[PDB]
């Protein structure tokens, strides 16, 4: 029943002891917006030192209770929380859309990964085991993974609910308590998560939320009772050879640039296209790009909502202005989009941008824009691309499009990108294993590695026989 | 054939490109000693920036070759190096003793763990596997662990050859190159390892050694081509209840305090002893402590060699002086030990020390001495000890002596110590799993976790079908 | 709302294509009972060859659909079935009690393990991964675990619902279809499971149920389209004189009289050290005489009836032979007549405690499958380990002592696959860590049972050229 | 220094208590040959019941010592045996060649896998760990893998030293003892392994060797002290017209003519797409006719003789029946007489390539176990899949096409457990990732073979008090 241009936060945005609270202390005052309308949905207080201390002391007490619960008990509560998220999916997706501006289409996908994450770690909480080892004469050594205590999770504005689920689910599955600090741009959706954990049966204090910016974050990092803080060259390339399947390359290109309004570092923004198919690819992309439905994020047919805020939209438009000054040819977009609905008129919209005649020395090719901007760079040979494209960090992604798999695997072996795609490109958070595919699963390793980030190995040795003295 | 009071370094102490070299640049000049005699075994140059750059550039080139070798090929060379260490064990142990001062007894034990470590990781190099996952429509995702590049290992003086093996074996098993910086106190034994890797068949540059202190270490940390650097409340308690087996507790106590001349952080120095058995335990400990054979570390019967250096010896003798000022009762030792052999006259020896009438406010109970000093503190009940002993950090060890296992497991559950011992106490480096027991093995987790420290997960997705466009 | 002495099966007991069906052919006719009343709850037909063929052909078709579903999709449906079991727990526990006779207390515990099992394997279905390996020149090898096809589950009467969930959850999590054959003694509770899987969203045919005995079982084993069939001295308890008396007595009673002592794993041979023999024997008889025998649907009942009249007759026969052989019956070992007249024809007997037992006595040698405790006196640690170690690996053992060196020494010496120190849990063989409550399954158990219901498929991709030896 | 036409066994062929022995009992008398010459290298006695009993009793005693050794100690001994195999590689490869007939080229490859296998399991022996689990109130459960006891290895003639290593290395790494029964065709090379284990430091009895056939094998299976016995449409190759010709031809020859095509693994049914039939058939015949047939000890030999005269006669019989049934012999299928007169009575034949092959022909239906390639023409992807999906899981398949969508589609459709894309490796079933050179074993293969040679022991420690239901 919740629609665009109506929502106003009517409750406090901090969460401690199983209840929404006003911060005890201030480190600022921020405004959260509905990017679709440009309306202020909340004027909230940034948490000070005393408030951060209260949230950590509260989490410490909940940790002491929760860490004493068995794996199977923590699993039951996390599986209930996953069922509550699934039942309230649309309500959560709606609230995510209002504050962030992504399409209800993409918000539902984030909520799915959110409850999937919770079930995965709940499963791991229930099945965890340490090692048992035999020592001579009946003596034995055994290991167990223990939680750390109070963990802090830092939020980002591009995947608010998802980052919050993805940080808290493993931390909590381990036996830890979490103090979460959302991005001051997106304070709202993390409270839905806090409320849902409480409903599922987590002890009061286990998942706390303190709102704030840099000063709040610093108070959390510096807090002596905080065990751990979980934070959030060239840019991600997309290579399109002339032997590729045109339609799939065009579809991949648009998916790699214009999903989440292109406000992701995952995005395959540098689109290296082979000289022979340049013209055909460029024309088909512009054609498919001009068809992208820009509008109200709550509408089922919207595939492009607004940019997070007004300063962010101005920055993206600034990059387009500098691009054409530097010699780029704007094919479509890169300008303010005006919707027909007068309730969306002060909303932060723009037309998706496709740039041709791009060079490696251009700032639009060098810098990550965080907007719907595609840079098309022409290339001649496999050797040339790999030279221009291998200045990419491991933390980034890459995609290759070719029908010949020998070429594909050769290019994937050469590129320094941690996540590679062959004849596809998925835009998904870094933390997601197997490039964030739908019917993929998490595998086993990802959870093992993230479980050990939120825990410590305790070792016990039992001497059965007598002590062998060196003296 | 190598004996005490004769060895002098006659070759350069840096190692690059499969050969011993003089540093190209200086950041100081250090003296390495034979602690048994107080003789200077080497006057060496500390590596400067240009020298660190040469060693890293050389490691970079070796990395490029080695990382391209298969797991099975890296395994063959690491198993051959383990065979060479095992064949040259006594020569290595002797050279370790001359520079460090530990007994040939303890040096052999370190060399054993060293070649055991190399076999373990060689086995893991050969059997490594990533994950394969099925995606809908014949599509698939897969992972692989790749090396980082040039890894740096920082050495310590207490386990010179052991720390160099333990850091390099996993790093190299992964496909990395290592630049190793030994402690300026112990430069010599790491060159034996460098030489052995070369003999085994590692490419020139794969295991480099640069000598130096803090400035050398800083140059290594700051080097832009260095992928990763591997570094190194109350103190480790030992609880002795009155229901324990006396002889085993006394043996454990002496092992926990006087092995490696008590120059280890993991040593169980705070010895909480229950009021009823205090007198009998104290007397038996002093009796067994006064029997400890102090002398030339090359002698098979020596169980106590000299302290690393004269400044270190002076510091320990200073702690004993402050302890008796604060109210401690010295039972035995804590003074200069003079050997009968005139070649050991200027060596850094002291008698193992046993202190009674100790309190929790005394600096000898609060501070880590790094010498053979045992603090005996009387206690009344299980509740009292656990209060006085739970100011211990996770990174530390603990030991409990009692015949009742319910008490033992209760105390082990309550203590914050990462490594716990029941009716025993092993003094072993932190990195060692299952408290560094002899016929223990490393299990599976330890290697998995250490591999993951020296590598990164590369993910590849292959789209078999068509791209599903949201637009 | 379901109570004792009222239930009658009013629907067919076979299940195929998402519906209860009458078998297409016969291999017999069995009677299922309510052991608390002795009433016939069902007269059912044992499945013949044609019926077994129909159930397998149906499972084959469902397998083809289900095996094509992703891990995550199979997980969703198995987690829903676990939620349905949990919501209907009391209804399932009640129906289990009526047909089997165990206490509502113990039935709830079995149902808990049943939905816990489903969640575990659902989790593993979602997170399964094969291995990826690099070969020279960009070439690579990879593995995947594939289902087998039509798997058969064979049921037992002592844990009807538990066995059905325990065999079907992993088989189904793998991508297989199952044809389940319950024990002809307990046909009823497996249909609740069949119905629940259907409700959860399994395709019709994925979990079929054919009723029958040995002939039905043989038809299933011999069926050419069946990929795999998953089938269904004695366990000692050593009580040293340095043990904690109350804990040993509690452990003894738990190890003998739970599930009416009808489990094979039960610690029936109770070796007790000579010094505490008398005190231990007296305290045990005292606690045993206090065991609440009655209607299993009652919350305070800890002992219901024995499964059958021929089964009850057999246990009573062992007691008769025991006292003939020289045993001294302290309490029980005779027909129990409850207060409630609706329980008058129920298969009830008082729990038995036997003293003055010897190793040559048939009650100490043979497995009774009733509430019978044999107390054997012993002198030393060396003696027990001689008399007691003639136990096979598939059995359990328990040791009671305050000294852990003795405990671990005894546990190291005994050939028993599952050992207990200062406790004794009575739980199915298949349950890891001796079937403890807040234990979990660990990781290995599931990996091993996943392996039983699947096969490793290997694929090698050559990137470069073929290296010819010729 | 060892050459063809000279070797004679001069010692007994049984091995017990760290020494070569004559069997105490007889179940037959077999002759072992040098297939390259037709010479008798040994006339040996097949072990009877009493001899099998002695070897098992001896293994039982060694088991008791070895099982008590730590993982690290068993690892040391197995790493020393791998080093001894590696140092004596050529001597072992030579002795393997003399008795079996494979090329020194292929024998070295088998010896490599043999010492690689030993190192792998030695590594696993050193790093083994069970599970540790927390239970409420400080209580805990733990697991450990224990050896079984006396394990029996059954040998095959096609990979003598390899099978002996592959069965013994894991069995021994677990803490077991092994009684090994080689194929009566190849008794010799397993004694080199027995002798090498002894030299490495295994206790006398740990690796015993009893020679014999079926009656010996039956005595081993029936022996009450034996814990476990480890025993030993056809594999298609699909060549589409969009494949790389040279790689397909190379793959075809590798898949048919390695190990004289005497493996069950071999991709003998060669389905070739109608457009490339003629070009492929002619290129195959060309490369087949240039395969170097001769003395297996020569470095350039790629084809030796067949294991024995009866096997050679069987293969020649298949060729005779093939041309009767309508096949067109392009090359081979007949007695080969080498240039060397010492190879005169050797079991040689020229490698065979058959065209005009139909599905109803016995050469396409039956496994030949000789160098015989059947070329069957096909029209479409749908046709091959129907004609080729009659292949069991235990078999292999290979597909040659430049389009990977087709390749993965065909690999998904085929029931073969091991599939190859644009390659075909001929390697023993037990080998993971299709037996590639710089592959490694991965982790799962060893975990699964460890489980086969061991049993899980579970121990529960109650820290608190016993929770009584009564
Ligand atoms: Na609100
Ligand atoms: Na609310
Ligand atoms: Na961000
Ligand atoms: Na020197
Ligand atoms: Na080792
Ligand atoms: Na050092
Ligand atoms: Na030298
Ligand atoms: Na070097």
| B259 touching chain A per CB within 8 A | yes
| D136 touching chain C per CB within 8 A | yes
| C130 touching chain B per CB within 8 A | yes
Residue to test with chain B: of D77, D119, D175, D436, most B Cβ within 10 A:
D119
Contacts of A307 (CB under 8 A, 6+ apart): A35, A101, A261, A263, A313, A316, A348, A349, A350, A371
Alpha carbons B18 and C167: distance in angstroms, whole number: 60
| C129 touching chain B per CB within 8 A | yes
What is the DSSP track for B431-446? TSSGGG-TT---TTHH
Q: Do A422 and B136 touch (CB under 8 A)?
A: no
Report the CATH number at residue A452.
Answer: 3.40.605.10
User: Of B216, B208, B230, B211, whose CA–CA distance to B49 is shortest?
Assistant: B216
- D326-340 per-residue burial string, b: 16 or more CB within 10 A, e: under 16: ebebbbbbeebebee
Give the CA dihedral D168, D171, D176, D177, nearest 10 degrees. -20
C371: tokens are 């509430």
Say whether both C18 and C124 belong to one domain. yes
Of the candidates A248, A292, A433, which has its C-beta nearest B467's C-beta?
A248
User: Cβ(A241)–Cβ(A401) under 8 Å?
Assistant: yes
Report the CATH number at residue D353.
Answer: 3.40.309.10
Within 13 Å of residue A461, how many CA atoms lie on the same side as its CB? 29
| B142 touching chain C per CB within 8 A | yes
Say whether both A21 and A163 belong to one domain. yes
Q: What's the gap in Å between B202 CA and the centre of ligand 8?
A: 8
User: Cβ(C223)–Cβ(C52) under 8 Å?
Assistant: yes
Q: At what angle do helices C104-127 and C89-100 cross, to 10 degrees?
A: 120
| A11: exposed, middle or buried (Cβ count in 10 Å: 0-12, 13-18, 19+) | exposed
Calculate ∠ Cα C96-C101-C104, nearest 5°.
Answer: 60
Quick one: which H or E segment has residue C231?
Answer: none
Q: Do B434 and A139 touch (CB under 8 A)?
A: no
CA distance A133 to chain D (A): 5
Say whether both C88 and C228 belong to one domain. yes
Residues 58-117, chain B, touching A (beta carbon < 8 A): 105-106
Give me the sheet containing A226-230, strands edge to edge. Answer: A19-21, A14-16, A207-209, A177-181, A150-154, A226-230
Q: Do D143 and A132 touch (CB under 8 A)?
A: yes
Alpha carbons A26 and A29: distance in angstroms, whole number: 8
**Which residue does chain A place closest to D136, by CA atoms?**
A70
Alpha carbons D19 and D29: distance in angstroms, whole number: 21
Say whether both B285 and B261 belong to one domain. yes
Q: What's the gap in Å between A110 CA and the centre of ligand 2?
A: 21
In this structure, what are the phi and psi dihedrals at residue A464, rounded to the nearest 5 degrees? -90, -45
SS3 assignment, position D5: coil
Residue to test with chain D: of C459, C464, C465, C467, most D Cβ within 10 A:
C459
Q: Do B409 and D138 touch (CB under 8 A)?
A: yes
User: Cβ(C233)–Cβ(C363) under 8 Å?
Assistant: no
Beta strand C140-147 with B140-147 is: unpaired
* Ligand nearest to C-alpha B2: 4
**Which residue does chain D place closest to A72, by CA atoms?**
D135
Say whether both C184 and C79 belong to one domain. yes
Other CB atoms within 10 A of residue D150 CB: 27
Say whether both A100 and A50 belong to one domain. yes
Which range of residues forms the domain containing residue C334? 234-444
Residue to test with chain A: of C68, C71, C72, most A Cβ within 10 A:
C72
**Which residue does chain D place closest to B414, by CA atoms?**
D138
Alpha carbons C315 and D282: distance in angstroms, whole number: 79
User: Of C255, C272, C219, whose CA–CA distance to C387 is shortest?
Assistant: C272
Residues 358-417, chain D, touching A (beta carbon < 8 A): 402, 404
Contacts of B77 (CB under 8 A, 6+ apart): B200, B201, B202
User: Cβ(C186)–Cβ(C62) under 8 Å?
Assistant: no
Domains in chain D, number? 2
In chain D, what residues touch B70 (CB-CB under 8 Å)?
A: 438, 440
Quick one: which H or E segment has residue D286?
Answer: helix D277-288
Alpha carbons C122 and C285: distance in angstroms, whole number: 45
Alpha carbons C178 and C121: distance in angstroms, whole number: 15
CA distance C133 to chain B (A): 5
Other CB atoms within 10 A of residue B237 CB: 26
Method: X-ray
Q: Do A133 and B441 touch (CB under 8 A)?
A: yes
Residue B285's alpha-carbon distances to B102, B246, B359, D326, in angstroms, are 22, 10, 19, 95
Say whether both C51 and C195 belong to one domain. yes
Of the candidates C291, C437, C462, which has its C-beta nearest D423's C-beta?
C462
In chain C, what residues touch A73 (CB-CB under 8 Å)?
A: 438
User: Cβ(C132)–Cβ(B142) under 8 Å?
Assistant: yes
CA distance C111 to chain A (A): 15
Quick one: which H or E segment has residue D24?
Answer: none
User: Cβ(A272)–Cβ(A238) under 8 Å?
Assistant: yes
Q: Do B70 and D438 touch (CB under 8 A)?
A: yes
Q: How many residues does chain B have?
A: 471
User: Of A468, A465, A459, A469, whose CA–CA distance to A132 is shortest?
Assistant: A459
Within 13 Å of residue C428, how many CA atoms lie on the same side as its CB? 21
Question: Which candidate in B151, B244, B265, B266 is catalytic?
Answer: B265
Contacts of C165 (CB under 8 A, 6+ apart): C85, C113, C114, C115, C117, C118, C193
Count of pairs with CB atoms under 8 A, one residue in A, one in D: 35
User: Cβ(D4)–Cβ(D295) under 8 Å?
Assistant: yes
Say whether both C117 and C138 belong to one domain. yes
| C246 touching chain D per CB within 8 A | yes
Alpha carbons C338 and C291: distance in angstroms, whole number: 13
Question: Is the C-alpha dihedral spanning A365, A369, A370, A376 positive or negative?
Answer: negative
SS3 assignment, position B467: coil
B438: tokens are 């002899």
Other CB atoms within 10 A of residue C340 CB: 15
Alpha carbons A234 and A363: distance in angstroms, whole number: 11
SS3 assignment, position C248: helix
Residue to test with chain C: of B69, B142, B245, most C Cβ within 10 A:
B142
Q: What's the gap in Å between A159 CA and the centre of ligand 3?
A: 9
Say whether both D462 and D421 belong to one domain. no
Q: What's the gap in Å between A12 CA and the centre of ligand 1?
A: 8
User: Cβ(A457)–Cβ(B442) under 8 Å?
Assistant: no
Alpha carbons D165 and C109: distance in angstroms, whole number: 48
| A137 touching chain C per CB within 8 A | no
Of the candidates C83, C124, C405, which has its C-beta nearest A464's C-beta?
C405
- B127-140 per-residue burial string, b: 16 or more CB within 10 A, e: under 16: bbbbbbbbbbebbb
**Which residue does chain D place closest to A139, by CA atoms?**
D70
Whether C181 has a binding-site annotation, put simply, is yes
Q: What does the DSSP 8-state code read for residue A259?
A: G
Q: Do C71 and A441 touch (CB under 8 A)?
A: yes
Say whether both D307 and D417 belong to one domain. yes
Residue D292's alpha-carbon distances to A327, C183, C411, D282, D289, in angstroms, are 66, 64, 62, 19, 9
Q: What's the gap in Å between B319 CA and the centre of ligand 5?
A: 41
Say whether both B405 and B461 belong to one domain. no
Question: Which candidate in C264, C352, C357, C363 is catalytic?
Answer: C264
Question: Which candidate in D221, D264, D357, D363 is catalytic?
Answer: D264
| D442 touching chain B per CB within 8 A | yes
Alpha carbons D300 and D104: distance in angstroms, whole number: 9
Q: Do B421 and A463 touch (CB under 8 A)?
A: yes
Say whether both C29 and C146 belong to one domain. yes
Q: What does the DSSP 8-state code read for residue D293?
A: B
Of the candidates B420, B449, B463, which has its C-beta nearest A460's C-beta?
B420
Binding-site positions of B: 181, 368
- Among this protein's residues, is C46 annotated catalytic? no
Beta strand A270-274 with D236-239 is: unpaired
B253: tokens are 């106590």
C10: tokens are 């009013």
Query: Which residue's structure tokens are 């030579």?
Result: D94
The terminus-to-terminus CA distance of chain C in angstroms comes to 80
CA distance C174 to chain D (A): 17
């Amino acid at each position: 029943p919740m629609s665009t241009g109506t929502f106003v936060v009517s409750q406090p945005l901090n969460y401690r002891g199983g209840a929404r609270v006003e911060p005890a202390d201030a480190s600022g005052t921020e405004k959260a917006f509905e990017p679709a309308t440009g309306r202020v949905i909340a004027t909230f207080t940034c948490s000070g030192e005393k408030e951060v201390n209260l949230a950590v002391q509260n989490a410490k007490a909940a940790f002491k209770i929760w860490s004493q619960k068995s794996g199977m008990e923590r699993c039951r509560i996390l599986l209930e929380a996953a069922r509550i998220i699934r039942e309230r999916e649309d309500e959560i997706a709606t609230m995510e859309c209002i504050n962030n501006g992504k399409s209800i289409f993409e918000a539902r996908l984030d909520i799915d990964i959110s409850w999937q994450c919770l079930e995965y770690y709940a499963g791991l909480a229930a099945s965890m085991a340490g090692e048992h080892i035999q020592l001579p004469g009946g003596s034995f050594g055994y290991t167990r993974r223990e939680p750390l205590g109070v963990c802090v999770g830092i939020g980002a504005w591009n995947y608010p609910f998802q980052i919050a689920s993805w940080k808290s689910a493993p931390a909590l599955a381990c036996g830890n308590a979490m103090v979460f600090k959302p991005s001051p741009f997106t304070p709202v959706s993390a409270l839905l998560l806090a409320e849902i954990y409480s409903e599922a049966g987590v002890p009061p204090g286990l998942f706390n939320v303190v709102q704030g910016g840099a000063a709040t974050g610093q108070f959390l990092c510096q807090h002596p009772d905080v065990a751990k803080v979980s934070f959030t060259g060239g840019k991600s390339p997309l290579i399109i050879f002339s032997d590729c399947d045109m339609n799939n390359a065009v579809k991949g290109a648009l998916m790699a640039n214009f999903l989440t309004q292109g406000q992701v570092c995952c995005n395959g923004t540098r689109v290296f296209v082979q000289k022979e198919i340049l013209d055909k690819f460029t024309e088909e992309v512009v054609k498919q790009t001009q068809r992208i439905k820009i509008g109200d994020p709550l509408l089922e047919d919207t595939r492009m909502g607004p940019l997070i805020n007004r300063p962010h939209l101005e920055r993206v438009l600034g990059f387009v202005k500098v691009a054409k000054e530097q010699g780029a040819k704007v094919l479509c977009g890169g300008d303010i989009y005006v919707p027909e609905d007068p309730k969306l008129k002060d909303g932060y919209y723009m037309r998706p941008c496709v740039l041709t005649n791009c060079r490696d020395d251009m700032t639009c090719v060098k810098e990550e824009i965080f907007g719907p901007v595609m840079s098309i760079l022409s290339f001649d040979t496999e050797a040339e691309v790999l030279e221009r494209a291998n200045d990419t960090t491991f933390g980034l992604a890459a995609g290759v499009f070719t029908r010949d798999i020998q070429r594909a695997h050769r290019v994937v072996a050469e590129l320094q990108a941690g996540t590679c795609f062959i004849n596809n490109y998925n835009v998904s958070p870094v933390e997601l294993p197997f490039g964030g595919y739908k019917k993929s699963g998490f595998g086993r390793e990802n959870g093992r590695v993230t479980i050990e980030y939120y825990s410590q190995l305790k070792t016990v040795c039992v001497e059965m026989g007598d002590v062998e003295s060196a003296f």
